[PDB]
Design a protein around this ligand. Sequence first.
Ligand SMILES: CC(C)[C@@H](NC(=O)CC1CC1)C(=O)N1CC[C@](O)(c2ccc(Cl)cc2)C(C)(C)C1
Length: 268
Amino acid sequence: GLTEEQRMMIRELMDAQMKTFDTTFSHFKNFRLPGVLAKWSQVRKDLCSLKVSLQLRGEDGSVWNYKPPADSGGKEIFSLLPHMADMSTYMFKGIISFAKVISYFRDLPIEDQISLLKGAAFELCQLRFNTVFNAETGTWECGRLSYCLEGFQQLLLEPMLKFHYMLKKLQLHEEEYVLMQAISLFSPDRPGVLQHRVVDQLQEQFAITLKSYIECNRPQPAHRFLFLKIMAMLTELRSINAQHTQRLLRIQDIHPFATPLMQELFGI
Ligand SMILES: CC(C)[C@@H](NC(=O)CC1CC1)C(=O)N1CC[C@](O)(c2ccc(Cl)cc2)C(C)(C)C1
């Protein structure tokens, strides 16, 4: 029950995703790695909930594993930040490419293009990471790189983690993920947005397309209210995003970690 324009819209987003999402992270290389060897307490709390171990599988069959240090409250807590800055940068590049390949996005004035990207980049990054998230093992499988959460459901108290588990449980199709990305990208309320009426109508069309796609393709009782669950999830993500900007701004105060691209995207 999808209109030709709805069908064309999904196709354009699926095409843009295919071209700009390297699911195997093959071109993510030359990144930094942790060394072989007060307002800080706020940074300690914000970081400790987000601890991950890092595994790197080599082409030859070798495996490098990194287990992070204890919080001791010092320096040790930023060991993985240069690596994460490099991952964020690589992902942000893919997100920018994604937006630049979409007709509806290219057509907006350059000022609004920049304003939508600075506002949604983090959200689109997190949505892409959810597709590589293994909820059974608590790990993001990024090709040769694996990021494993270091109890029980006390990690679901961290909004970022609750978001990933709750979104993974919805068992979304590639189309629903790409539609979520479009709804987040075309948010008319991002600071510096001039074409607020155009961006708003565009977003409404992506939301209608998603609502209609679900109605036509997911008839089972488990998918009842799925459109509304997804929409509440995007509201939660906007809230996680505002919180994350604040946490990143605090880390940047104690020690500059942000790459030129992250500085550009976070307004630094
Ligand atoms: C979801 C969360 C646990 C985490 N994912 C990971 O560890 C595994 C990656 C593959 C998905 C993540 O995506 N973030 C978001 C970015 C982050 O806030 C941050 C990055 C760089 C700098 Cl300089 C400062 C802060 C972070 C603290 C790393 C937590």
